[PDB]
Design a protein around this ligand. Structure first.
Ligand SMILES: Nc1ncnc2c1ncn2[C@@H]1O[C@H](CSCC[C@H](N)C(=O)O)[C@@H](O)[C@H]1O
Length: 230
């Protein structure tokens, strides 16, 4: 069964949907979707290192299991802004934020609603890792954020990192056997359209074998984008 059915739209229901964190604290499911899993930890650490590489003000979109967020907090940053839609996940963010070393700025809502309220050229780093909220935005939800907000929000020299594992897992099953080719063909044109220059786009590949029973990702490598504003 596909994660999304034809014409499925979960966006208006995401906020009020109960957040299901299992007792073993290894997964997060919302509306029966596999939103986050702890096997992703080394990869979440690579994204966190990329978004926090310039220090200063870091914007993180999607809180999930706080894996990337706890790694961002290990870097010498000044502010950690976090946008989260789901009420259940936001309560976990609310409990996590006080004990953190670097000031956390928690904001509740869809980035579609919250990001327009954020100041232009204010962030040294951006980490985008949400989840598709509709079948037709399965491979493209990150592009809407990158085009409308990532470029304007970054300071000159600022770094954007992001991922979309539901998309990339699928594209690595049939269409591609080389993860850098997959990135070049499916991601680079939208980033160029967003205002980023090709010479300012790099990628880091890392070895990570997912579990055998993982339906949404099977490729034994992960790709970390580093998209710098000119
Ligand atoms: N449009 C949107 N705006 C804000 N948050 C969203 C969103 N769509 C999904 N979310 C939230 O995005 C998150 C994706 S899971 C993120 C996992 C995180 N990188 C970690 O390391 O633990 C979830 O908390 C989900 O509720």
């Amino acid at each position: 069964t596909p994660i999304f059915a034809p014409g499925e739209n979960c966006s208006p229901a995401w906020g009020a949907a109960p957040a299901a964190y299992d007792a073993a604290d290894t997964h997060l499911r919302i509306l029966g979707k596999p939103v986050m899993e702890r096997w992703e930890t080394p990869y979440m650490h690579a994204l966190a290192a990329a978004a926090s590489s310039k220090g200063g003000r870091v914007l993180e979109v999607g809180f999930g299991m706080a894996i990337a967020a706890s790694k961002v907090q290990e870097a010498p940053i000044d502010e950690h802004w976090i946008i989260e839609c789901n009420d259940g996940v936001f309560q976990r963010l609310r409990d996590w934020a006080p004990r953190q070393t670097h000031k956390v700025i928690p904001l509740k809502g869809l980035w579609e609603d919250v990001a327009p309220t954020l100041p232009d050229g204010h962030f040294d780093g951006i980490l985008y890792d949400t989840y598709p909220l509709s079948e037709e935005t399965w491979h493209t939800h990150q592009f809407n954020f990158i085009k409308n907000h990532a470029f304007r929000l970054l300071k000159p020299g600022g770094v954007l990192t992001y991922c979309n594992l539901t998309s990339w897992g699928e594209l690595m099953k049939s269409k591609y056997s080389d993860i850098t080719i997959m990135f070049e063909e499916t991601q680079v044109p939208a980033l160029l359209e967003a205002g980023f220059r090709r010479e300012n786009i790099r990628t880091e590949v890392m070895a990570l074998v997912p579990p055998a029973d993982c339906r949404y990702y099977a490729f034994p490598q992960m790709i970390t984008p580093l998209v710098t504003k000119g």
